[PDB]
Amino acid sequence: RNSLGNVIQFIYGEDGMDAAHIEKQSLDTIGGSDAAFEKRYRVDLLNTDHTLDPSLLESGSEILGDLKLQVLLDEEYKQLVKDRKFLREVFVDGEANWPLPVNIRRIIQNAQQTFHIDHTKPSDLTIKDIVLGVKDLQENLLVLRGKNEIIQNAQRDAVTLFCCLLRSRLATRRVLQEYRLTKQAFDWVLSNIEAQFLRSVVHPGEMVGVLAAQSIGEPATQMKVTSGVPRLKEILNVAKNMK
Amino acid sequence: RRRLKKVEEEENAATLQLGQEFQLKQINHQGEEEELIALNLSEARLVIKEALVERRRAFKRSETREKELESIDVLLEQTTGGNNKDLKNTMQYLTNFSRFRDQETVGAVIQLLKSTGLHPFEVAQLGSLACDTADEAKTLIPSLNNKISDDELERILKELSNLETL
Amino acid sequence: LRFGEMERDCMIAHGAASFLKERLMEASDAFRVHICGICGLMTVIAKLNHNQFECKGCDNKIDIYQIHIPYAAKLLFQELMAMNITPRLYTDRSRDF
Amino acid sequence: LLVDVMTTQGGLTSVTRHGFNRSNTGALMRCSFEETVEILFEAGASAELDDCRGVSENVILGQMAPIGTGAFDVMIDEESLVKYM
Amino acid sequence: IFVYQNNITPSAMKLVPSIPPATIETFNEAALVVNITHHELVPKHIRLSSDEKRELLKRYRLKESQLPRIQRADPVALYLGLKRGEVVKIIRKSETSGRYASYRICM
Amino acid sequence: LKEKAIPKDQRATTPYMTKYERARILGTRALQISMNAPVFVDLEGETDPLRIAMKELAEKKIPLVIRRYLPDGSFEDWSVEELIVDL
Amino acid sequence: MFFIKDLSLNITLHPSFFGPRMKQYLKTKLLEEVEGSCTGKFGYILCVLDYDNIDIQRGRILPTDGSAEFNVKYRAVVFKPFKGEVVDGTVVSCSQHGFEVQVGPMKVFVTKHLMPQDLTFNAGSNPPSYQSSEDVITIKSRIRVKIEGCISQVSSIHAIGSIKEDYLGAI
Amino acid sequence: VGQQYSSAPLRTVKEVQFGLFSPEEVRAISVAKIRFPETMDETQTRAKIGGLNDPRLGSIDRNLKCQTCQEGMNECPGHFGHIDLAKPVFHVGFIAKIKKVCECVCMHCGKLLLDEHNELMRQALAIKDSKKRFAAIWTLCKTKMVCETDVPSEDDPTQLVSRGGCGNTQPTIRKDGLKLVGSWKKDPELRVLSTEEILNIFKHISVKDFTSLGFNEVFSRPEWMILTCLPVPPPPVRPSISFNESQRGEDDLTFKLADILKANISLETLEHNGAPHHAIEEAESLLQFHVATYMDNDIAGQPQALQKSGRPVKSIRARLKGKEGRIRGNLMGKRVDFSARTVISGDPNLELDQVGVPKSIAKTLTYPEVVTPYNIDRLTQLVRNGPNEHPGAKYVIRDSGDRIDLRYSKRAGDIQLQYGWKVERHIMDNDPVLFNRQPSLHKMSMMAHRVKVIPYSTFRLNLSVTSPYNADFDGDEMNLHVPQSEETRAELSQLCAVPLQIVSP
Amino acid sequence: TXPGVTXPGV
Amino acid sequence: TXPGVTXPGV
DNA sequence: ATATTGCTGCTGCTGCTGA
RNA sequence: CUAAGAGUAC
DNA sequence: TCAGCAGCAGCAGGTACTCTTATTCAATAT
Ligand SMILES: [Mg+2]
Ligand SMILES: [Zn+2]
Ligand SMILES: [Zn+2]
Ligand SMILES: [Zn+2]
């Protein structure tokens, strides 16, 4: 808001994130082919077309043929397909590298280097544990603390793209096969993701107007169709007639 | 508003112009509004006594006119220190010209005046001045003109005279 | 040294309010002035030696406040008054936000 | 944020004395940009009231602007202070 | 809604505002060849009911004037038939978050 | 002020102390220590008021409260005790 | 007349005084400041009511100063004279120009213009007093007076009253 | 000593209420009436009573106190006077507004031309912004040239309702210089509208009428746009900065006020003695010109009122406007103390957040440290060392306000420090200091460093930190600001520190 | 405009 | 108009 | 003999018969 | 004091 | 129910910082 109290943006940067806490990351669901997508995420316990190696996890020889777990996998993969469709609608060019607050890849590498993942012992995790932990972490990423329908909807809309990133990285197949997290390593990863997200939220009292003005002016000092300072002057001074 | 300079009507009790800060309704410290409770002399004296004895107790945890004067002077010197010549004079005045004695009679007077249902300033004036007759009361307090019936006014002043005990 | 406009803007961007206030007041020019309560003008005769405060024109002696403003601000207000403009300073809100 | 400020009034508001500076945002902070004396005269004639919420108003008055560290009030709690000892 | 070929004579433009609550809106066919709301630059506009506006102002502690403004001549405002005081919710595809919802009050 | 004060049971602000709040709390406490205010923590030989206030904040012995002002004029009172200093 | 009223006072405390007894210090400093005071806004202020628990509120630190400003609210008993009101009092002094009557903490001056014609001043009567053909008003005499004038000073409210009216005088 | 104790309550300004001075308020606040243009009496050694330097307005000499408040030049704000004008004159900043208002209001009966009966006046008056409502009222009522004593009924345009109109023809009003000329359409009659009749017709505007035009009933009525009493600023506003070491040199405002007084006296004498209307009008025009050029000397078209020395007169408006005027040159940005500036050199042996400070600069700049039981010994030692050697103290600020200068204080002997005193001492190592390079285009050009005292004449900084500053070592100069309190020091270290700015937003 | 950037006009 | 803001007209 | 005075940027209205 | 000129780092 | 035209006039100008040089006449009257 400005001095009069008029709303400029209903949430800062349309995400409520401090700019210094943003890093470029890749959305893995938006890219790739359909066959590559299914090979990456689709897991089917009932059939052998997309079954998982029982050596991946301790219960892999016992969960085979389960029904409730298959329901969880079905809803997870349906959510992932929905996320792919949403991201392809959002980004027409298909660009996957975008700035987002929390760097998941470094957290996964830290967990791998900290707990000494041997990559041979069958994983202690259970599929239900992974799915429910990700679902709860989605709910623990709070930007708005209000307790009414308007604020709840705004909060849900403010973290949708980071939630898409989180589902893209912390998928069941990816956790069990590519990264081979253990139980404790997965819990540690969840805790750090939550803490870093809560640490990347913008601080009230920030003078974002002066920051934006300086962050636009300084590159201009560092500086067919007109461009550069004359074009910036033509834009800021809304001129009826331009070159 | 925030008028530069200020014009207001002059204070006049006979006209019932108490003042801008002595209006009928006052906002209490709890956020709601209350009637401006106008204490008569006896009720005000009892309130002063209650406040002083409560202050004495709180500091502790952390009748003939001669002996009442001695009690008020001793408790006053025990409770408060300097800049109390005003308070000393007020307290000796209160014990000198006192109309009622204790809690019972002042409660009876206040409930009677509530039954009269008159202005708090006017009921305080009625309780303060020990009048005798009707027209005498009406001329002592100009605000009494045609507010309560003659029979009711006469009887209530009769119970003021009766409850004027000791 | 001149503490220019854009230096003040950088310090605003940092969020350092108290440092900016100290730069503009305690380091350059801090001046205490007495103002009336009925009117916002600085037309208050304040005899500090005798502990007397009187605003001629409002006929008051009990509703006076003191403020700390830059001397340049006092000069600006006096120049506005000399140019037939009244910059009344009030220390309470007459309107809700 | 820049393009949101420029279009928040329903039209394209330029960054010029004929654009943003013409809003009803406070006489003291409007005069600090350009056309100082004319703004003061118009505020005097129209009897504008300045709420002193802007940065420029408190800068002129030499008082802590309600920005950054000034965006809140620090207060002493008697009960907590007794509670510590 | 009235649709005309070229123009309306001012002698009829003056009587276009009829007895309330009947409102006459005039459109040109040339302006209606292309549906502007299908442009990708144009985000989604949803008119709010009175109760929704009241809830919006209550939850955000806003006054009427503290909302962003949309003119009562904006092409989408004419398209949706906004009257003054009515608030449109604007759903946008943000690039920092997937979805962003703004609000604009008609003026 | 009764209307302005949001009741404690329905505060809707972040439970984390902001950088500006922490900076002002440290500055205020160091200024008070420099002016001979009583210290609520045991000193291990430190003499700098700023680091004394930092030690007080580390173990939450600062008896101050932040009055966070909402844009409409309402406020919420958050004690330094209950604010989580994650930064 | 006597009332009790809601009042508020701003007290500033230095940083060195924020010990565990801060509430006690504030409660004591409300006294000795407004107890037994005299203002034109509220007349006299004799005592504070409800001293058991005085509402002290939080206390805001003045920035760059460190001192804290408390807005303490309380009940105070007050005595405000009013023009056009009748009150009892005790005659304490007399003179050619009039006589002074003690009422509570204040003195009310009744001028010679506001006594009946036969109630002339006389220095022959001891003490020099305002005497009529039926009664004499000397020192230490009860009297009812109707107040008609008030001028306010910081240290002493001054009042002018009258005893000409019917049934006004010695009871 | 600064300013001594005052019993008045201390508050902060919450709201600024603008408006216009009423003549009676000007006469009420004034402490003196100014009637003589001479600043000094015939002896040329005192301030003339009733002149422009009346002692009641404030003292012009340090050795003498103000005659009104009995305070020195340090304390006295200055008190206004007033000049009672012989005839009303226009305010130069309100001539256009006066023209619009008199064009919106009947020039005979003082009522707005189009009442609520007109169709478009409901729309115009329903505008809540005061400035937009006036624009609409003007652009709809400028074209009407009759008071319309009878108007069609609002219910239906069949029967006629008679309002309080006077039925007179309004003129077409233009401005010819500083005067408004009205050409009445022939019932043309061209004549100059006297400010007397304009003032009279403004004073007859009803409260409802001018409150719909944007004016306020209390703070700015339209008739206050006409000047009848000039407020005279005190000598603090217009000081006599005599630099000839003997000859007083007066401010431009003093000369303009003397000219206004001369013209006022001339007009008064001409009116009293009786004269042809031509001379009276000429004197009135001269008075109007002098007042207008006093408030604003940059009037378009008219020639500038040249000063004595032949240069243009600096008016109040010129004093206020500009990059070097009050607002932009003394309030938004001002010169400050406790600052240093010098050439910068690189140092690979300094940490990223360190800055090397020349020893002499460290000896000049000081920090005031409050004496505390925790730092009594080292502060005492610094006081013993004195100001001529580093580290040491330059001043001792006592609680009474007296300031012991450590130079010339060794004669008095050792000083015993008391808790609560201040030692104003040289900046030592590890002091947070703000550090700036003047073409400051973003926040990272004003980061905070830690002091490291070095034995040479250049500021020394790490090579890596030169990129955010955009600073080379080909002769660049940089500035240093020292915080003077614990709060500013703390927030400067906790918000603006160099490491906290490594990643930029 | 201004000057700079008179008025307009004047 | 004026000029500025001839006449009208001329 | 000494002091006073004579390149860049805009803004707005008036008026019908004829054919 | 004002005015003017030569500059230094951007 | 619609086709054709005109008039005018106004200056300053990015942020800090250093240094030097010169500064309005003549005549009348007390
Ligand atoms: Mg360089
Ligand atoms: Zn006043
Ligand atoms: Zn003075
Ligand atoms: Zn008329």
Side-chain angles (χ1 to χ4, degrees), chain C residues 1-8 10-11 13-20 22-35 39 41-51 53 55-58 64-96, chain H residues 3-4 6-21 25 28-30 68-71 74-75 77-78 80 91 94 219 224 227 231 233-234 236-237 294-295 316 319-320 326-341 434 436 438 440-443 445-446 481-484 487-488 491-492 495-496 501:
Chain C
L1 278 299
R2 164 96 176 167
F3 195 80
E5 288 190 70
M6 52 209 308
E7 287 77 7
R8 165 195 71 94
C10 294
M11 290 313 305
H14 275 308
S18 80
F19 181 86
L20 180 60
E22 187 263 328
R23 277 295 105 178
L24 300 175
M25 278 279 295
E26 274 76 1
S28 190
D29 51 345
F31 181 84
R32 185 274 308 295
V33 66
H34 286 90
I35 57 170
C39 71
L41 303 176
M42 303 174 303
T43 58
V44 174
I45 313 176
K47 309 193 183 186
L48 298 177
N49 48 358
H50 317 144
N51 206 2
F53 295 99
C55 175
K56 191 184 180 180
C58 304
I64 311 300
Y65 305 112
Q66 65 172 339
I67 66 178
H68 292 108
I69 51 163
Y71 187 90
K74 191 270 287 180
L75 189 65
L76 164 76
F77 294 144
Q78 280 188 333
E79 281 169 346
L80 285 179
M81 291 164 72
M83 198 166 64
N84 197 13
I85 305 288
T86 55
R88 305 179 190 282
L89 313 175
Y90 288 112
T91 65
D92 53 357
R93 300 296 175 110
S94 58
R95 302 187 322 199
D96 273 334
Chain H
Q3 300 207 35
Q4 64 269 33
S6 167
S7 55
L10 171 59
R11 272 89 169 91
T12 62
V13 174
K14 296 285 184 67
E15 298 181 350
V16 177
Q17 174 64 73
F18 286 96
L20 311 171
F21 263 116
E25 190 169 10
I29 62 155
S30 86
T68 300
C69 65
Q70 276 81 25
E71 299 276 4
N74 190 10
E75 286 280 334
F80 278 55
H91 189 152
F94 294 125
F219 299 109
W224 298 346
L227 289 161
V237 179
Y294 159 72
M295 287 180 185
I316 293 171
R319 288 165 60 121
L320 295 178
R326 291 292 167 297
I327 309 287
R328 294 188 52 189
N330 294 122
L331 287 165
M332 307 315 295
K334 54 185 82 174
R335 301 193 174 284
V336 293
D337 283 331
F338 308 104
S339 54
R341 172 186 184 88
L434 195 68
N436 182 12
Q438 270 302 297
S440 52
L441 299 174
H442 52 92
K443 52 182 300 183
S445 71
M446 211 166 309
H481 303 267
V482 186
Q484 301 289 286
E487 277 180 350
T488 58
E491 79 176 3
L492 188 63
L495 293 171
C496 316
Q501 314 292 320

Side-chain angles (χ1 to χ4, degrees), chain D residues 17-18, chain I residues 4-5:
Chain D
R17 75 182 75 92
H18 315 285
Chain I
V5 330

Side-chain angles (χ1 to χ4, degrees), chain A residues 183-229:
Chain A
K183 179 72 196 325
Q184 69 171 349
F186 194 65
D187 291 339
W188 187 87
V189 163
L190 295 185
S191 296
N192 294 115
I193 289 165
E194 176 177 347
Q196 287 202 30
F197 186 92
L198 290 173
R199 193 177 300 116
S200 303
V201 179
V202 74
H203 294 279
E206 183 89 16
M207 293 307 293
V208 298
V210 178
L211 186 68
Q214 290 177 334
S215 300
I216 290 154
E218 186 270 350
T221 66
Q222 304 305 108
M223 295 180 195
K224 267 81 175 187
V225 62
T226 71
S227 60
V229 180

Side-chain angles (χ1 to χ4, degrees), chain G residues 159-171:
Chain G
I160 311 301
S162 67
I163 51 170
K164 283 201 74 161
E165 290 294 333
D166 54 346
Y167 193 65
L168 270 299
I171 288 161

Side-chain angles (χ1 to χ4, degrees), chain H residues 43-75:
Chain H
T43 59
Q44 297 296 114
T45 185
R46 290 154 72 264
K48 181 177 201 184
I49 307 307
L52 277 168
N53 288 8
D54 209 6
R56 285 172 293 182
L57 311 190
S59 64
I60 59 170
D61 184 2
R62 174 53 260 187
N63 277 3
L64 278 81
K65 311 283 189 184
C66 172
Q67 188 161 293
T68 300
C69 65
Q70 276 81 25
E71 299 276 4
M73 292 180 75
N74 190 10
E75 286 280 334

